[PDB]
Amino acid sequence: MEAPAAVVTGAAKRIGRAIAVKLHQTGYRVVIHYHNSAEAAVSLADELNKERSNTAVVCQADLTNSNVLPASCEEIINSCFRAFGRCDVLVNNASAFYPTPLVKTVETQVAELIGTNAIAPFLLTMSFAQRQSNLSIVNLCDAMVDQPCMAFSLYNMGKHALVGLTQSAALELAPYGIRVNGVAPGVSLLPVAMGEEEKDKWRRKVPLGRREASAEQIADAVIFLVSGSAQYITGSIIKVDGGLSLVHA
Amino acid sequence: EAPAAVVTGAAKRIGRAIAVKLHQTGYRVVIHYHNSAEAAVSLADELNKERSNTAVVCQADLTNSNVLPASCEEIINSCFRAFGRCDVLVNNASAFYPTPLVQKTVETQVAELIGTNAIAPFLLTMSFAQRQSNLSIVNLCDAMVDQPCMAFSLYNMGKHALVGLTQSAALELAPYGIRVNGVAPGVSLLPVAMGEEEKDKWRRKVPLGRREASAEQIADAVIFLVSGSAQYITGSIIKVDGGLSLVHA
Amino acid sequence: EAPAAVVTGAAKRIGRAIAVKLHQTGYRVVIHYHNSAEAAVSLADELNKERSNTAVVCQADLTNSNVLPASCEEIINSCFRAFGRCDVLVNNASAFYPTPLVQKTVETQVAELIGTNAIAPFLLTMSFAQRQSNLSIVNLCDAMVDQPCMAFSLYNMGKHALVGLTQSAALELAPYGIRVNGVAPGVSKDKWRRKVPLGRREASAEQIADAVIFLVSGSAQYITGSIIKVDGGLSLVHA
Amino acid sequence: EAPAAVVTGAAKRIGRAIAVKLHQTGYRVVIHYHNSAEAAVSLADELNKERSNTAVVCQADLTNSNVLPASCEEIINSCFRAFGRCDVLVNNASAFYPTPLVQKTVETQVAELIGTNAIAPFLLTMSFAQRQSNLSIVNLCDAMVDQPCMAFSLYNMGKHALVGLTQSAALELAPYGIRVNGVAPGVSLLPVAMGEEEKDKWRRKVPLGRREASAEQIADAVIFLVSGSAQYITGSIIKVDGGLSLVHA
Ligand SMILES: NC(=O)c1ccc[n+]([C@@H]2O[C@H](COP(=O)([O-])OP(=O)(O)OC[C@H]3O[C@@H](n4cnc5c(N)ncnc54)[C@H](OP(=O)(O)O)[C@@H]3O)[C@@H](O)[C@H]2O)c1
Ligand SMILES: NC(=O)c1ccc[n+]([C@@H]2O[C@H](COP(=O)([O-])OP(=O)(O)OC[C@H]3O[C@@H](n4cnc5c(N)ncnc54)[C@H](OP(=O)(O)O)[C@@H]3O)[C@@H](O)[C@H]2O)c1
Numbered sequence: 001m002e003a004p005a006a007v008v009t010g011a012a013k014r015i016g017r018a019i020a021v022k023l024h025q026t027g028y029r030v031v032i033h034y035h036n037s038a039e040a041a042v043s044l045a046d047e048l049n050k051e052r053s054n055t056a057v058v059c060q061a062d063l064t065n066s067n068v069l070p071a072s073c074e075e076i077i078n079s080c081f082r083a084f085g086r087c088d089v090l091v092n093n094a095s096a097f098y099p100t101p102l103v104k105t106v107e108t109q110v111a112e113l114i115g116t117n118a119i120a121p122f123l124l125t126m127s128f129a130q131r132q133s134n135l136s137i138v139n140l141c142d143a144m145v146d147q148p149c150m151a152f153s154l155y156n157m158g159k160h161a162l163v164g165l166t167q168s169a170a171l172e173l174a175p176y177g178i179r180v181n182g183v184a185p186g187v188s189l190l191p192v193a194m195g196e197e198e199k200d201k202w203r204r205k206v207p208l209g210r211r212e213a214s215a216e217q218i219a220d221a222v223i224f225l226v227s228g229s230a231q232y233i234t235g236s237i238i239k240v241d242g243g244l245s246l247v248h249a
Numbered sequence: 250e251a252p253a254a255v256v257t258g259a260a261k262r263i264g265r266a267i268a269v270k271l272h273q274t275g276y277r278v279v280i281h282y283h284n285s286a287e288a289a290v291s292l293a294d295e296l297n298k299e300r301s302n303t304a305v306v307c308q309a310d311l312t313n314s315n316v317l318p319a320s321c322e323e324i325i326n327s328c329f330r331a332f333g334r335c336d337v338l339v340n341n342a343s344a345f346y347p348t349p350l351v352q353k354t355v356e357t358q359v360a361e362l363i364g365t366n367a368i369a370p371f372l373l374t375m376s377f378a379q380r381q382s383n384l385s386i387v388n389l390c391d392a393m394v395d396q397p398c399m400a401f402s403l404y405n406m407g408k409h410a411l412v413g414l415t416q417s418a419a420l421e422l423a424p425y426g427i428r429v430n431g432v433a434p435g436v437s438l439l440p441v442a443m444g445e446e447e448k449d450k451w452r453r454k455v456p457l458g459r460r461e462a463s464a465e466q467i468a469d470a471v472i473f474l475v476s477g478s479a480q481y482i483t484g485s486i487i488k489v490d491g492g493l494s495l496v497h498a
Numbered sequence: 499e500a501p502a503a504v505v506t507g508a509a510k511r512i513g514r515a516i517a518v519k520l521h522q523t524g525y526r527v528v529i530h531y532h533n534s535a536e537a538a539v540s541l542a543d544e545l546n547k548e549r550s551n552t553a554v555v556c557q558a559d560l561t562n563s564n565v566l567p568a569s570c571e572e573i574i575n576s577c578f579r580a581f582g583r584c585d586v587l588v589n590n591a592s593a594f595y596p597t598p599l600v601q602k603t604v605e606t607q608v609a610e611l612i613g614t615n616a617i618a619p620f621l622l623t624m625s626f627a628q629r630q631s632n633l634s635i636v637n638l639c640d641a642m643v644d645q646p647c648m649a650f651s652l653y654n655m656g657k658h659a660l661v662g663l664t665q666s667a668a669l670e671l672a673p674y675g676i677r678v679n680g681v682a683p684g685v686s687k688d689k690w691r692r693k694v695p696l697g698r699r700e701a702s703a704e705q706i707a708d709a710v711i712f713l714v715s716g717s718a719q720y721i722t723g724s725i726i727k728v729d730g731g732l733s734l735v736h737a
Numbered sequence: 738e739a740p741a742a743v744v745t746g747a748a749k750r751i752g753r754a755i756a757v758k759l760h761q762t763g764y765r766v767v768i769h770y771h772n773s774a775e776a777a778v779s780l781a782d783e784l785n786k787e788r789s790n791t792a793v794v795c796q797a798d799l800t801n802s803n804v805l806p807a808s809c810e811e812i813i814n815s816c817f818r819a820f821g822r823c824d825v826l827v828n829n830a831s832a833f834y835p836t837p838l839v840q841k842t843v844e845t846q847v848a849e850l851i852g853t854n855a856i857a858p859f860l861l862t863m864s865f866a867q868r869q870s871n872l873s874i875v876n877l878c879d880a881m882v883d884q885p886c887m888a889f890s891l892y893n894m895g896k897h898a899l900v901g902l903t904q905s906a907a908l909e910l911a912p913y914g915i916r917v918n919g920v921a922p923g924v925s926l927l928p929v930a931m932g933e934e935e936k937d938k939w940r941r942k943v944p945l946g947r948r949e950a951s952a953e954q955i956a957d958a959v960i961f962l963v964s965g966s967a968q969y970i971t972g973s974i975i976k977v978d979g980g981l982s983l984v985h986a
């Protein structure tokens with residue numbers, strides 16, 4: 001009852017998994033939210049519960065925008081209170097990412113890219129605050145939102161909307177002692193299936209070490225922002241990009 | 250011979266001033282409106298009295314829905330039907346009201362605030378580009394996006410998403426010769442519902458003249474960005490705020 | 499009658515295009531120069547042939563030193579002595595060269611880069627404001643200030659300082675009806691041209707000058723503390 | 738062997754807090770000071786009583802002059818003379834006073850405000866890099882540089898120049914494995930000269946707790962940036978402002 005509890009969206013794999021593991025290692029009980037990756041979510045929960053019993057549960061939800069998304073987001077937050085009796089930390093990590101050229105239906109693309117990257121964060125933030133000591137929300141942003149990838153307008157719109165949520169929610173929730181911050185990766189984990197020749201093109205752009213961030217390096221910034229060492233920090237977005245965003249064309 | 254412009258939410262206030270000033274510059278205009286049919290028709294009558302066959306109205310709800318892409322395609326189609334071309338799109342229409350995080354359905358609020366401020370601009374941008382010189386798009390942004398109104402999360406999210414669209418569409422549409430820029434008012438025409446005491450509180454905050462922007466002052470920056478004097482400007486957002494965004498708390 | 503403008507570094511390139519376009523708009527102009535006397539006088543001769551006694555030149559070193567305040571007071575005073583008024587100040591003069599962090603003295607580089615790009619604009623702003631119907635200052639900024647050229651630390655510091663001055667001066671001078679804004683060129687090598695999204699159009703000094711003309715016009719009377727990027731979209735392009 | 742840090746302006750207030758927290762983390766420290774000799778020596782004595790031979794003082798004026806490069810080289814050299822290495826540089830020393838545009842010589846004000854806030858950090862960064870594992874530089878910026886205090890032009894110019902240095906130095910020193918970041922306080926320790934009524938005016942503006950940052954809160958963000966938990970972070974500026982910069986006029 002004395003261990004704090006965290007919800008991490010899109011926690012089965014990659015960066016969300018690293019966040020969930022590092023929160024667990026810091027002493028949090030975790031809700032591992034997932035959409036399609038059930039086997040991976042359950043494997044992570046079983047690993048964490050082997051390390052300390054009754055410290056991890058999974059929660060499935062589609063975070064695409066729809067008439068039912070508010071209820072789904074309320075139920076993710078409720079899953080943390082039902083398992084652990086509290087919810088101290090929300091990490092909005094789940095995200096759709098694919099091109100939408102201006103030149104799936106376009107409204108499905110809107111629902112997926114704006115829903116996962118912005119509306120679901122907003123509704124999870126409402127539900128988190130309504131249900132409420134070091135409370136905080138961390139949003140996974142994008143260091144490159146001002147130099148965006150060609151043909152990613154909806155993704156980019158969603159990530160800019162998430163900056164606006166981070167700022168608006170930081171201002172409105174400060175009186176409740178809820179801090180709201182972001183972590184903005186540059187290039188972190190690349191797709192397994194991406195050719196090494198294409199991965200290397202991206203790695204060579206990064207000033208600091210000519211490599212992508214590990215998931216753990218992203219998670220380290222999340223751990224800092226939820227810690228007692230960040231008690232005066234709200235409305236801040238920490239770039240974890242190895243200097244990538246400083247590199248001109 | 251005369252270029253043509255679409256102005257969304259053009260029946261009243263800033264959109265009306267933009268439509269008038271484009272018309273005075275030589276443009277044929279589509280006056281888009283949602284509810285303000287009498288004002289839209291009155292404006293078209295006034296512009297047509299000055300030069301015949303230079304203004305038409307087009308009704309559309311720009312709330313997000315599965316038919317919003319068709320409504321946006323229809324607005325651009327209405328410009329081609331009336332005038333045989335579409336040179337300028339001004340994304341001005343916008344919903345604005347509070348959406349507190351702590352306590353219309355929330356999904357209707359998402360649809361209205363994110364639809365009008367961000368998704369409709371995106372879909373109008375797609376339709377504008379697909380249907381294609383001095384081609385340009387001007388998005389009406391908000392100079393106060395980083396110092397937002399308490400309890401305006403969804404509005405602020407939509408205006409941040411509009412910044413993202415302005416940048417992403419500038420990058421992607423540059424090869425087609427379409428420039429995409431923004432105009433960011435601070436306090437301009439104050440809400441019709443606001444009491445006089447509250448209006449004077451906001452006026453006194455503005456360094457340059459202790460007054461709100463006129464609609465015509467906002468329209469002047471739109472006129473610059475669509476002109477031949479801006480043909481190397483794309484992805485830029487011009488604040489028209491009298492210095493308000495420079496004022497600390 | 500006619501308003502008057504000071505343009506620093508006005509003998510060549512962007513300053514010259516700004517001076518010509520202000521003159522064409524109906525301003526009388528002070529053409530400031532440091533080393534380019536022949537070019538400054540050639541420009542003044544071209545403008546005075548169009549309208550008599552509407553252009554003068556003014557020599558000043560804008561390197562920071564013990565005398566830079568007096569030099570900046572003289573540039574503003576030159577406008578008031580020639581024309582009886584000073585409505586517009588365009589801070590265009592700039593030094594540009596690399597200053598690597600790892601291996602002219604470095605303090606000479608500070609005096610040139612920080613002096614010309616930031617301190618002279620500050621002192622000219624003070625002198626302009628102290629001597630005071632559509633009054634404004636336009637600072638020539640840099641669209642790539644947040645994605646800087648490798649080994650250009652002092653240049654980049656000076657251009658960031660000039661953003662700070664634009665904002666601080668906009669705030670402090672708004673009560674005097676003086677607007678303060680910036681224009682931020684991108685590129686004004688074929689390598690650089692190929693990266694520009696609007697690169698089908700040639701970058702020109704006239705395009706920068708067009709943004710300056712907008713900002714000093716009545717069409718910008720509510721605009722202060724704004725920096726207009728004129729970069730063809732270059733600052734949007736990722737590495 | 739213990740790493741070593743230089744902290745400028747470290748005799749009192751935030752610089753002392755940074756020196757203390759670096760010492761508690763296991764660094765040997767150079768306590769730079771200008772006028773505060775008694776406070777600097779009293780701090781070095783306290784740190785040396787905790788662990789012998791872990792703190793020294795170094796006096797220097799960081800006003801700009803033709804000698805400033807030699808002074809900055811000497812500060813870095815004092816860390817190597819004492820400790821055999823120099824792992825961290827914290828640029829904290831800063832002059833802060835108004836310089837009204839409309840009415841010390843102005844050139845003295847330039848030398849002090851631009852010297853301490855920008856040129857000395859630049860020259861110390863050059864000396865730090867030239868003299869060269871987890872190497873990093875942390876610059877103390879200002880969260881309110883875009884909403885500045887009235888009549889502080891030179892101070893604001895100096896802090897904007899420091900942001901430029903942070904980004905330029907991050908790009909250029911990344912290949913040498915030197916990270917360069919910033920910490921941007923909003924309101925922390927209020928000026929000693931300020932009356933309680935004026936201090937309370939500022940405190941009431943801060944969303945998160947209606948109070949200024951403690952010196953330790955600022956030092957916490959510095960400790961994070963120099964730590965292994967920030968190995969991929971360079972060119973980032975962490976606001977530590979309690980949401981103050983999000984508050985509109
Ligand atoms: N990787 C990078 O280089 C990078 C760069 C910049 C920003 N970021 C940001 O960092 C965060 C993590 O990145 P990442 O690469 O680890 O993410 P990712 O692998 O692309 O996606 C994370 C998870 O999001 C969940 N998700 C996707 N669509 C969803 C939906 N409709 N409903 C619910 N959940 C859904 C998925 O869960 P299931 O697998 O369970 O279906 C997926 O595993 C994201 O916010 C991303 O934008 C990453
Ligand atoms: N006024 C300011 O101080 C200020 C400040 C910052 C930014 N801005 C921006 O500048 C632009 C103009 O501002 P304004 O105050 O003139 O705007 P406004 O009066 O609030 O709204 C403009 C028009 O938007 C239309 N609109 C609202 N909901 C809509 C929907 N669901 N579908 C279609 N149209 C809809 C309305 O058309 P009908 O009347 O026909 O229904 C309305 O007349 C907006 O983008 C605004 O965000 C304004």
Ligand SMILES: NC(=O)c1ccc[n+]([C@@H]2O[C@H](COP(=O)([O-])OP(=O)(O)OC[C@H]3O[C@@H](n4cnc5c(N)ncnc54)[C@H](OP(=O)(O)O)[C@@H]3O)[C@@H](O)[C@H]2O)c1
Pocket residue numbers: 506507508509510511512513530531532533534535558559560561589590591592593594610614638639640641682683684685686
């Ligand atoms: N060119 C670009 O692509 C570009 C890009 C970004 C920003 N900008 C900005 O746009 C503005 C104009 O650019 P530009 O390329 O036309 O500038 P420029 O040719 O490099 O220099 C303009 C003038 O500055 C004056 N100047 C230089 N050092 C001086 C000193 N110590 N004292 C007095 N005057 C001095 C010179 O006048 P004299 O010849 O009389 O000695 C010079 O002709 C600058 O502020 C620049 O930073 C330009």
Ligand SMILES: NC(=O)c1ccc[n+]([C@@H]2O[C@H](COP(=O)([O-])OP(=O)(O)OC[C@H]3O[C@@H](n4cnc5c(N)ncnc54)[C@H](OP(=O)(O)O)[C@@H]3O)[C@@H](O)[C@H]2O)c1
Pocket residue numbers: 745746747748749750751752769770771772773774797798799800828829830831832833849853877878879880921922923924925926927
């Ligand atoms: N306090 C805040 O609320 C706040 C807000 C925003 C940003 N910051 C930034 O955070 C840092 C620490 O702030 P603070 O309030 O603790 O600073 P501070 O007390 O105003 O100044 C720190 C030290 O700077 C040194 N300094 C001043 N002029 C100098 C010179 N000419 N040569 C060498 N050193 C000089 C002084 O050393 P001596 O005492 O030995 O003479 C002084 O103790 C500063 O960079 C500041 O700009 C602070």
Ligand SMILES: Nc1nc(N)c2c(n1)[nH]c1ccc(O)cc12
Pocket residue numbers: 094095096097142186187188189190191
């Ligand atoms: N959800 C999600 N997944 C990703 N793989 C990226 C992403 N968001 N943003 C990215 C930006 C750059 C990149 O290389 C990858 C990503």
Ligand SMILES: Nc1nc(N)c2c(n1)[nH]c1ccc(O)cc12
Pocket residue numbers: 342343344345391435436437438439440
């Ligand atoms: N559609 C729309 N209408 C408004 N009246 C404002 C708006 N957007 N943004 C505003 C920001 C400030 C303000 O005083 C008013 C507004």
Ligand SMILES: Nc1nc(N)c2c(n1)[nH]c1ccc(O)cc12
Pocket residue numbers: 591592593594640684685686
């Ligand atoms: N005074 C001055 N002169 C220049 N040529 C540039 C400059 N400032 N900034 C530049 C940025 C890019 C570039 O290609 C050129 C410049």
Ligand SMILES: Nc1nc(N)c2c(n1)[nH]c1ccc(O)cc12
Pocket residue numbers: 830831832833879923924925926927928939
């Ligand atoms: N060197 C220095 N000392 C200070 N006391 C402040 C400062 N810089 N910046 C500040 C910004 C706000 C404030 O209340 C105080 C300060």
